[PDB]
């Protein structure tokens, strides 16, 4: 029996692995080269239960054929967390949409084909960005909830990357659904969808702390780096810890409750403010080196926009998530020890 891991050397995924890993599963995932799969392997210390996969393009709909025609038969469990979330992009219906969409059509597919009959579980890695409209965040009076989906079309949603990258995310969703919808009777699993919030925490690996990191974990580095007359950064969102993200994704699985839902993964809202004043307090180092603004006029103290219900979800996946002090302390601690400042 095996669990497979689409994107394994991801931010998130990287925590996935880890939580299945010390659950005893045998895990299975892909990476882009053999490279990063090496490199995967070797920092979860050459675990005889762990092997990876080259997938080099999750644009392409045969993409997944390969893994599923030789290991389909062991697979039990489908971890579909790959999606382009990356902004160095020339084209946002080509860079954005069409991967995300053809990713999640490409692996379902590959799994009618060749796993039919053995796959019992597919996790989507969705998003917020599915669910809530951005140009409504800012409203106190609206409700966000598991049943609400993102407005924008395609087409709509290409006026700028941001939002395509939002519309990416809605599309490969909802074409995970029509899937589903459309061969009901043709396979036998049943379908997940795990939609975060911005995701923080550390790294797996402290190796894999660089100047730039993963873009929602780079929105806290970069904060660290401004001087104290810069310009504080616009950002109204729920927050979320990775290892919270990580195990969501095996409760998501693992519950019969879980089937046929999306799953909000959010603790709370926050702004950059937020932020600051936990970096400010907990990091003497940076006081001082870094803004202060309006201390204590952000979301952890403030209705600041629209209500986020996720409720449902919370008393869907049974535990409790981490506070922002926590996310925030733990992501920018193990930045300040590659940076040398401790
Ligand atoms: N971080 C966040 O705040 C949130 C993230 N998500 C979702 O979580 C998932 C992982 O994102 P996250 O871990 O945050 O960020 P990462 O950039 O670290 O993860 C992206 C992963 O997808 C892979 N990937 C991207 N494009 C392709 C492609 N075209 N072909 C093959 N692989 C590809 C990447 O490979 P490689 O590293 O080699 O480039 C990487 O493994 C995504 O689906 C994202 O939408 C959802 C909500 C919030």
């Known amino acids: 029996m095996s669990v497979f891991v ?3 050397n991801g931010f998130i995924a990287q925590h996935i692995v880890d939580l299945l890993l010390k659950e005893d599963y045998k895990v299975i995932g892909s990476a882009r080269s053999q490279e990063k799969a090496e490199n995967l392997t070797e920092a979860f210390g050459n675990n005889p239960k762990f092997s990876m996969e080259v997938v080099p393009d999750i644009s392409k709909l045969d993409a997944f054929d390969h893994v599923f025609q030789k290991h389909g038969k062991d697979i039990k469990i489908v971890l579909h967390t790959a999606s382009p979330f990356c902004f160095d992009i020339t084209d946002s219906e080509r860079d954005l949409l069409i991967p995300a969409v053809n990713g999640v059509k490409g692996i379902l597919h590959s799994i009618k084909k060749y796993a039919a009959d053995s796959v019992e579980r597919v996790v989507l890695t969705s998003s917020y960005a599915a669910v809530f409209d951005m140009a409504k965040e800012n409203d106190k009076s609206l409700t966000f909830n598991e049943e609400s989906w993102n407005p924008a ?13 939002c519309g990416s995310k809605k599309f490969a969703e909802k074409a995970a659904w029509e899937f589903l919808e459309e061969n009901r009777d043709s396979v036998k699993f049943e379908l997940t969808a795990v939609n975060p919030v911005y995701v923080f925490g550390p790294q797996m690996f402290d190796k894999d702390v660089k100047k730039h990191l993963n873009t929602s974990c ?7 780096h401004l001087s104290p007359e810069d310009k504080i950064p ?3 969102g729920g927050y979320i810890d990775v290892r919270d993200v990580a195990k969501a994704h095996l409760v998501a699985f693992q519950k019969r409750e879980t089937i046929g839902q999306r799953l909000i993964v959010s603790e709370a809202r ?7 004043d936990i970096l400010n307090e907990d990091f003497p180092v940076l006081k001082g080196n870094i803004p202060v603004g ?13 209500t986020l219900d996720n409720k449902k979800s919370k008393k ?14 733990d992501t920018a601690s193990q930045i300040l020890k590659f940076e040398g400042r401790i």
């Not at 780079?218 to 660290?224: A, D, P, R």
């Not at 869907?316 to 302390?329: S, W, Y």
């Open 234 to 236: 616009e950002l109204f």
């Open 218 to 224: 780079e929105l806290v580095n970069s904060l660290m």
């Open 270 to 276: 926050f702004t950059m403010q937020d932020v600051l």
């Open 294 to 306: 309006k201390p204590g006029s952000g979301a952890t103290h403030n209705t600041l926009g629209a």
């Open 6 to 8: 689409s994107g394994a």
């Open 316 to 329: 869907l996946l049974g535990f409790k998530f981490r506070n922002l002090k926590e996310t925030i302390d």
């Open 153 to 165: 079309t395609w087409e709509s949603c290409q006026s700028d990357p941001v939002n395509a990258y």
